[PDB]
Write a structure and sequence with these properties.
This protein has about 110 residues and is mainly β. It has one domain: SH3 type barrels (Roll). Helix content is about 10%, strand content about 40%. It has one helix and seven strands, in the order βαββββββ. It is globular and about 35 Å long. About 30% of the residues are buried. It is classed as viral protein.
C-alpha cells in the first residue's frame, strides 16, 4: 500500500534514550522508515529547546495534505545543518527510535510509504 495507518507514541524529549536515527540524511530517512514499519518509532513534539536536545540529522513528519479515519496524511523530511531534504507541510513532530519509553499521547498518522 502507498499509505499505512500508524499510531505513534508521543515521547517527552527528556525521556528519549536514542536521540536520532544515524549519521547522514540518507541513513536517518532509511532507519526512520524501517522503525515506522517495525512499530519501533516515537514522535517528539517540537517546541523551544527540543531540537538542540536531539541529534542531527533530524527526521520530521510533515502534513502532506488537508485526514482519513482520524489519521493525518504525513511524509518524511530530513534536516542537516539547516538544509531540508524533502518539501512538505506543517511539522507534527520529530521522529526518534522508541525503546520502551512511556508515551504521553498517541498521534494517528497515514504515512506516505
Amino acid at each position: 500500500k502507498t499509505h499505512v495507518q500508524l499510531s505513534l507514541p508521543v515521547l517527552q524529549v527528556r525521556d528519549v534514550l536514542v536521540r536520532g536515527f544515524g549519521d547522514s540524511v540518507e541513513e536517518v530517512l532509511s532507519e526512520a522508515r524501517q522503525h515506522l514499519k517495525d512499530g519501533t518509532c516515537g514522535l517528539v513534539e517540537v517546541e523551544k529547546g527540543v531540537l538542540p536536545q536531539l541529534e542531527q540529522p533530524y527526521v520530521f513528519i510533515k502534513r502532506s495534505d488537508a485526514a482519513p479515519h482520524g489519521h493525518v496524511m504525513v511524509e518524511l523530511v530530513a534536516e542537516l545543518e539547516g538544509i531540508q531534504y524533502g518539501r512538505s507541510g506543517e511539522t507534527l513532530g520529530v521522529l526518534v527510535p522508541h525503546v520502551g519509553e512511556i508515551p504521553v499521547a498517541y498521534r494517528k498518522v497515514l504515512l506516505r510509504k
